[PDB]
Amino acid sequence: GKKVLIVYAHQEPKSFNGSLKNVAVDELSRQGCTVTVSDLYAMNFEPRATDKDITGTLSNPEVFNYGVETHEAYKQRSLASDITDEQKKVREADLVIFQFPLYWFSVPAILKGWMDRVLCQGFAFDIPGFYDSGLLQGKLALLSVTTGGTAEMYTKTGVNGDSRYFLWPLQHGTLHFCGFKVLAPQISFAPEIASEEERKGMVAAWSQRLQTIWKEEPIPCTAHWHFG
Amino acid sequence: GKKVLIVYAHQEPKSFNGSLKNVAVDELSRQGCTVTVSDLYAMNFEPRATDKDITGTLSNPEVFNYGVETHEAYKQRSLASDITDEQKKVREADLVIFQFPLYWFSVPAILKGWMDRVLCQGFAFDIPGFYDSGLLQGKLALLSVTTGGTAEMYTKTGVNGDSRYFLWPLQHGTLHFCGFKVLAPQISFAPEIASEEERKGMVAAWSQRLQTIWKEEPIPCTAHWHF
Ligand SMILES: Cc1cc2nc3c(=O)[nH]c(=O)nc-3n(C[C@H](O)[C@H](O)[C@H](O)COP(=O)(O)OP(=O)(O)OC[C@H]3O[C@@H](n4cnc5c(N)ncnc54)[C@H](O)[C@@H]3O)c2cc1C
Ligand SMILES: Cc1cc2nc3c(=O)[nH]c(=O)nc-3n(C[C@H](O)[C@H](O)[C@H](O)COP(=O)(O)OP(=O)(O)OC[C@H]3O[C@@H](n4cnc5c(N)ncnc54)[C@H](O)[C@@H]3O)c2cc1C
Ligand SMILES: COc1cc2nc(N3CCN(C(=O)c4ccco4)CC3)nc(N)c2cc1OC
Ligand SMILES: COc1cc2nc(N3CCN(C(=O)c4ccco4)CC3)nc(N)c2cc1OC
Ligand SMILES: [Zn+2]
Ligand SMILES: [Zn+2]
Numbered sequence: 001g002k003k004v005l006i007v008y009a010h011q012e013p014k015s016f017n018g019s020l021k022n023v024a025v026d027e028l029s030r031q032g033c034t035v036t037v038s039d040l041y042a043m044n045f046e047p048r049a050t051d052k053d054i055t056g057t058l059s060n061p062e063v064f065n066y067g068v069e070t071h072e073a074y075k076q077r078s079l080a081s082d083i084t085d086e087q088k089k090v091r092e093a094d095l096v097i098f099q100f101p102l103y104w105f106s107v108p109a110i111l112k113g114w115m116d117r118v119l120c121q122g123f124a125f126d127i128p129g130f131y132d133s134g135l136l137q138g139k140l141a142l143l144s145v146t147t148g149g150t151a152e153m154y155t156k157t158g159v160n161g162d163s164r165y166f167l168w169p170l171q172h173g174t175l176h177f178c179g180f181k182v183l184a185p186q187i188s189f190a191p192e193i194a195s196e197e198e199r200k201g202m203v204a205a206w207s208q209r210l211q212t213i214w215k216e217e218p219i220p221c222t223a224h225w226h227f228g
Numbered sequence: 229g230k231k232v233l234i235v236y237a238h239q240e241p242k243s244f245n246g247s248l249k250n251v252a253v254d255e256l257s258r259q260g261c262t263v264t265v266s267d268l269y270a271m272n273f274e275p276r277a278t279d280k281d282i283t284g285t286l287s288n289p290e291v292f293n294y295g296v297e298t299h300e301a302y303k304q305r306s307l308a309s310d311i312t313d314e315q316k317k318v319r320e321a322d323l324v325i326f327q328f329p330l331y332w333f334s335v336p337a338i339l340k341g342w343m344d345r346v347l348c349q350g351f352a353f354d355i356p357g358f359y360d361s362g363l364l365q366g367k368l369a370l371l372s373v374t375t376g377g378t379a380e381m382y383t384k385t386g387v388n389g390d391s392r393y394f395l396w397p398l399q400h401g402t403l404h405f406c407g408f409k410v411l412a413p414q415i416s417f418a419p420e421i422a423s424e425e426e427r428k429g430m431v432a433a434w435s436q437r438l439q440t441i442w443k444e445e446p447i448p449c450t451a452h453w454h455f
Binding site (some may be wrong): 166 | 242277291332340358384387389397401454
């Protein structure tokens with residue numbers, strides 16, 4: 001028995017991202033997995049890292065330091081409940097899938113805020129207690145990303161460089177840092193450009209990949225994998 | 229005369245980032261430059277890309293495509309005023325400095341939202357206006373970043389890898405894509421582990437570099453430079 005959290009960042013249910021999220025839910029549900037979706041836009045999820053994220057007495061009220069104050073708030077249980085709600089979902093999950101359109105070679109800001117606010121020190125990592133010693137060790141993570149650019153454009157000799165270059169901050173700097181084993185990303189290239197058959201193909205490839213997701217090995221989340 | 233925009237993303241005026249922003253203001257002001265600051269947290273800047281970003285009625289209110297709708301709204305002068313306020317500052321600027329602490333090998337979400345919302349198709353880029361021909365060509369951009377990790381931690385065979393690895397999505401994927409010439413980043417490594425005198429010295433060095441900022445050449449913003 002397995003628990004899956006899908007962190008989903010798209011404004012439009014009828015979008016290609018919406019379809020990818022829906023087939024994920026359908027297929028994991030069919031397998032008998034426990035499935036939860038955090039639909040960040042529908043939740044109006046707060047992306048800003050602010051002093052509103054701590055409800056208790058601040059450790060240093062004269063000079064506000066977000067990292068210091070959230071680490072302390074986590075230990076004291078004085079974090080805002082929207083953060084601790086998300087942390088519960090992550091804690092219980094065996095696999096976390098991020099479903100999002102690529103925005104400026106990265107996640108949309110609303111999802112960036114989820115990373116900034118939910119993955120605090122004490123919960124997701126400590127110093128020491130990061131990368132292979134990260135606190136979310138034992139969990140799997142997977143990026144399911146859609147692009148405007150074609151696969152052509154995302155090659156080493158294309159304008160945008162290889163797709164793996166833009167994965168580094170997310171796969172390594174965030175997920176690996178927190179101790180996740182990272183599964184190979186699912187990149188669905190340029191669905192707005194693609195034909196009807198090509199889009200249906202991309203949806204079914206994801207659906208089909210999910211059938212055997214629990215048999216996959218993680219990537220070696222290293223500089224060499226990303227950059228060669 | 230030169231116009232500079234500083235897009236600043238820290239919650240605390242007394243912070244190390246705050247000090248770096250303040251010396252940039254002081255030094256560029258001393259030089260006679262026109263200086264504007266967008267203090268994102270103080271503005272409570274909206275980071276979410278939503279249909280609220282378009283005023284009046286939408287191009288296709290059945291299926292919402294942010295990219296399409298904001299491109300159309302830009303062309304039809306129908307974007308929310310927080311966005312168009314920022315676009316005016318960017319249009320008039322000769323240099324845009326981004327002052328921020330590194331969050332997860334990237335910009336804080338509030339700053340990511342400025343990028344997502346302000347740099348829309350029609351304003352910052354178009355077909356064929358991207359990279360070398362991007363719509364903001366002729367402008368300079370500069371990332372001034374503070375980190376938790378020391379410089380040693382950010383070496384090519386360090387835990388965190390090379391600094392330039394994380395710069396790629398920001399410098400190339402974003403700024404170069406819009407046509408900016410990118411100046412070398414100012415990276416202020418690990419202010420929190422001090423010393424109080426060593427912090428003084430990083431602030432001073434940023435100020436010193438700003439003295440000759442207009443003489444500098446842009447980096448070659450290529451896969452090669454970063455990797
Ligand atoms: C601020 C911003 C920054 C961006 N930065 C980048 C960037 O840095 N690099 C880059 O490459 N791109 C970038 N993009 C482009 C962006 O990544 C794409 O527009 C997005 O990935 C497309 O996914 P979508 O779900 O919105 O597509 P949609 O427009 O929703 O889908 C395309 C088509 O697929 C159809 N569809 C939906 N479901 C199905 C289904 N079940 N079967 C068949 N068809 C279906 C839809 O009806 C639609 O016609 C950026 C976009 C924005 C707005
Ligand atoms: C969500 C999150 C994600 C993060 N992700 C990363 C990451 O991926 N990689 C990484 O390396 N780090 C990361 N960090 C750490 C972060 O980048 C550092 O905490 C930050 O850059 C420190 O900058 P600051 O301005 O807040 O320092 P401050 O705490 O504000 O500065 C340190 C000291 O400088 C003092 N000071 C202020 N002005 C001056 C002055 N002019 N002269 C002398 N001293 C002065 C202050 O009083 C303070 O004591 C993350 C932090 C958070 C909260
Ligand atoms: C090559 O890399 C990039 C590609 C991008 N594509 C788009 N779109 C989204 C909409 N498209 C369409 O097919 C389209 C046409 C009509 C309706 O929809 C593709 C262009 N928007 C961006 N902001 C991009 C940024 C990039 O690099 C930073
Ligand atoms: C190696 O790369 C990383 C370094 C990090 N350092 C910190 N600090 C900054 C240094 N601190 C301090 O001296 C300190 C101690 C007490 C108060 O302040 C706080 C933790 N916080 C993060 N979130 C980091 C994330 C990283 O990679 C994703
Ligand atoms: Zn890694
Ligand atoms: Zn470049």
